[PDB]
């Protein structure tokens, strides 16, 4: 049986899993979504007239950057318990990654849902971003709004984009980042807890090699790329488990570890799931992770196919959309980007 | 049916395939081996008490370098018609690569044998080197003699070793090299006939990318790594054919082109099969090609398995050994390096 989120507005508890120092935690653990008297309805495919084209964060036009920054400012200006707010969108990650929900709807009320460290990783985050993006666009009345993506698989895209930098007068800024690493700027996709001390050009080459490692060397089939099988009745897979998919355990983990501020108790914000969404760059990094799924299918190599197992296809989550309606979404429905009415600007 | 070398002392003809300018050739095309009255015997596995440990050309001990230089000197001083002589050993490559032998023993007396551009590439050169190494050791009474190998997969090993440089007073030297490239020192494993003019550290990265390309991205199964199926009745596969294996077409070809002297009519020595053996570095480059087969297996990836096709297993060649005996050797018997009593010093 597939993993199935419950009525998240009725069955939810404060996040308590996967956070080593909760007494000193700098962000909240009260991550449950707001109640608004809504009935959960099934997803319907979007009727957008145009396809949203996500843009490399180091190559944005003035309008693209200004719209993104203004949308995040609008999101920050919303009251916390508005489900479109900056805080509420961050809390989504905390709820689904740090033990907010259980498998009650599947007959396992005593087992939490975890969307990380398994084959749920790619589709969950694709859906999370799908609604996030459409919410941002609604806040500034831009119907073809698209997210930037951190194109760290291309050399000039590897430095963290200057749009995120400066100080707290910039809505895209977050004080809780590794200060040493922000000064270095070039993300280390192979980061393993120790700084490499190599020339910039070598770090660039290392990042390119790492992308091939995750997409080709280790991503040789759906199990190794998407991650291990995880179904109703299974306990949460631990962080670092070798059954985790190549991108999740590789470049994905590295960027979170690298940006997270080691002077904070849990390396907040990007350094723990529960706080990662308070850094605007969380979503923009993840937009390129989303893209890796697209690229991985395009390589046209043996084993690079999507999952056909019904217990994956029929797994579902619940999100608020830009109308503040509750929408249930299924893994099967996010495999085709054309039908989701977005893609990525490519060379 | 398997390709089968004939009695090379009875059936042999001058090389006339794959040599663009024959009349200007600076090495001989009369590459047939001498007739000593020997009977061809089947290979017996060696009984060496110790495994010969091939050493990176840039990290040899004083004794390692001294022994190698002395053994090449001894080989150069042998009478020309000794099958162990410097020129005789180089002629082997010419005979097997440039049309010396036919498939008479396979029922095709008017079709040549070619060991290049097919799945015969790796095992033919493994045997060639096996006997070459044992011959060199015998000439100086070093029963545990091992060849150096050009470790161009390691940044420090990428420059051509100074043990090969200097002038004619050095036995390891060959005047027929690209003088501009020798000055550059750092080999380009991606060389395509035109200098890149990039920083040395970028060339190092490019080389590392090429090794990753040949061993992982392109060498995904036995067909794509070892090369195409070549059997009795087949005509010689052309240089550049899409069926040639990843290493042979890639890093291997690049090094030969890069070292070969373009002011010579056939880019002798390394720039053509028929002349490559007159450069001592030929064998030392090829020792690392041989090591690529080892590494490719050790990766433990899907598709990284040895060939089990009888038409490969039962293919055979004939060589003179250190005792001037004629030995027939089969592909099947060189897949296990422990049984051949050699390996490579690794980090």
């Amino acid at each position: 049986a597939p993993i199935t989120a419950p009525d998240i507005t009725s069955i939810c508890k404060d996040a308590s899993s996967g956070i080593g120092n909760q007494e000193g935690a700098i962000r909240t653990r009260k991550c449950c979504p707001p109640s608004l008297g809504k009935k959960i309805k099934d997803f319907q495919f979007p009727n957008d007239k145009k396809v949203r084209m996500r843009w490399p964060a180091h190559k944005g036009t003035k309008k693209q950057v200004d719209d993104y920054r203004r949308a995040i400012a609008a999101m920050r200006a919303l009251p916390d318990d508005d489900p479109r707010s900056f805080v509420s969108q961050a809390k989504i990650h905390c709820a689904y990654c740090n033990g907010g929900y259980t498998q009650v709807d599947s007959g396992f009320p005593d087992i939490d849902i975890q969307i990380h460290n398994s084959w749920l990783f790619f589709p969950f985050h694709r859906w999370y971003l799908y609604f996030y993006e459409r919410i941002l666009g609604s806040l500034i009345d831009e119907p073809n709004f698209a997210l930037p993506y951190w194109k760290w698989d291309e050399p000039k895209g590897m430095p963290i984009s200057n749009i995120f930098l400066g100080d707290a007068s910039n809505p895209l800024y977050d004080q809780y980042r590794d200060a040493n690493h922000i000064e270095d700027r070039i993300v280390d996709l192979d980061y393993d807890g120790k700084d490499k001390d190599i020339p910039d050009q070598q770090q660039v080459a290392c990042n390119l090699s790492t992308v091939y490692r995750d997409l080709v060397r280790n991503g040789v089939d759906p199990t190794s790329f998407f991650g291990g099988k995880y179904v109703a009745g299974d306990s949460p897979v631990a962080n670092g488990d070798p059954s985790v998919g190549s991108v999740e355990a590789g470049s994905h983990t590295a960027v979170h570890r690298w940006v997270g501020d080691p002077t904070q108790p849990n390396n907040e914000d990007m350094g723990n799931f529960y706080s990662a969404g308070y850094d605007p760059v969380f979503y923009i990094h993840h937009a390129n992770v989303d893209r890796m799924w697209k690229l991985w299918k395009e390589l046209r190599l043996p084993g690079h196919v999507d999952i056909t197992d019904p217990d994956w296809l029929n797994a579902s989550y619940v999100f608020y959309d830009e109308n503040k309606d509750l929408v249930r979404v299924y893994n099967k429905d996010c495999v085709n980007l054309d039908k989701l009415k977005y893609n990525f600007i490519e060379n | 049916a398997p390709i089968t070398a004939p009695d090379i002392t009875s059936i042999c003809k001058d090389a006339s395939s794959g040599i663009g300018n024959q009349e200007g050739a600076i090495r001989t095309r009369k590459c047939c081996p001498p007739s000593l009255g020997k009977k061809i015997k089947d290979f017996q596995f060696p009984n060496d008490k110790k495994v010969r440990m091939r050493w990176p050309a840039h990290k040899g001990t004083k004794k390692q370098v001294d022994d190698y230089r002395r053994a090449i000197a001894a080989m150069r001083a042998l009478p020309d018609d000794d099958p162990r002589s410097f020129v005789s050993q180089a002629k082997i490559h010419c005979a097997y690569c440039n049309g010396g032998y036919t498939q008479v023993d396979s029922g095709f007396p008017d079709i040549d044998i070619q060991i290049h551009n097919s799945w015969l590439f790796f095992p033919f050169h493994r045997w060639y080197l096996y006997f070459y190494e044992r011959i060199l050791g015998s000439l100086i009474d070093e029963p545990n003699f091992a060849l150096p190998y050009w470790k161009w997969d390691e940044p420090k090993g990428m420059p051509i070793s100074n043990i090969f440089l200097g002038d004619a007073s050095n036995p390891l030297y060959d005047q027929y090299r690209d003088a501009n490239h020798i000055e550059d020192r750092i080999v380009d494993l991606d060389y395509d006939g035109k200098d890149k003019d990039i920083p040395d550290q970028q060339q190092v990265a490019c080389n590392l990318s090429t090794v990753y390309r040949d061993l992982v991205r392109n060498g995904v199964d036995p067909t794509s790594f070892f090369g195409g199926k070549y059997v009795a009745g087949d005509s010689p596969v052309a240089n550049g054919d899409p069926s040639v294996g990843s290493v042979e077409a890639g890093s291997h070809t690049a090094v030969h082109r890069w070292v070969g002297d373009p002011t010579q009519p056939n880019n002798e020595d390394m720039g053509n099969f028929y002349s490559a053996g007159y450069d001592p570095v030929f064998y030392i480059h090829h020792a690392n090609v041989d090591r690529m087969w080892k590494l490719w297996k050790e990766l433990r990836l899907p598709g990284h398995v040895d060939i089990t096709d009888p038409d490969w297993l039962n293919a055979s060649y004939v060589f003179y050994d250190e005792n001037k005996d004629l030995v027939r050797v089969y592909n099947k018997d060189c897949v296990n390096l422990d049984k051949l009593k050699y390996n490579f010093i690794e980090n």
């Binding site: 050399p155 050009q201 390119l208 992308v211 | 090429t210």
Partner: peptide, 10 residues
């Protein structure tokens, strides 16, 4: 899909 350090535009 990806540039390498061998490419002229790297």
């Amino acid at each position: 899909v990806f540039t390498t350090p061998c490419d002229p535009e790297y």
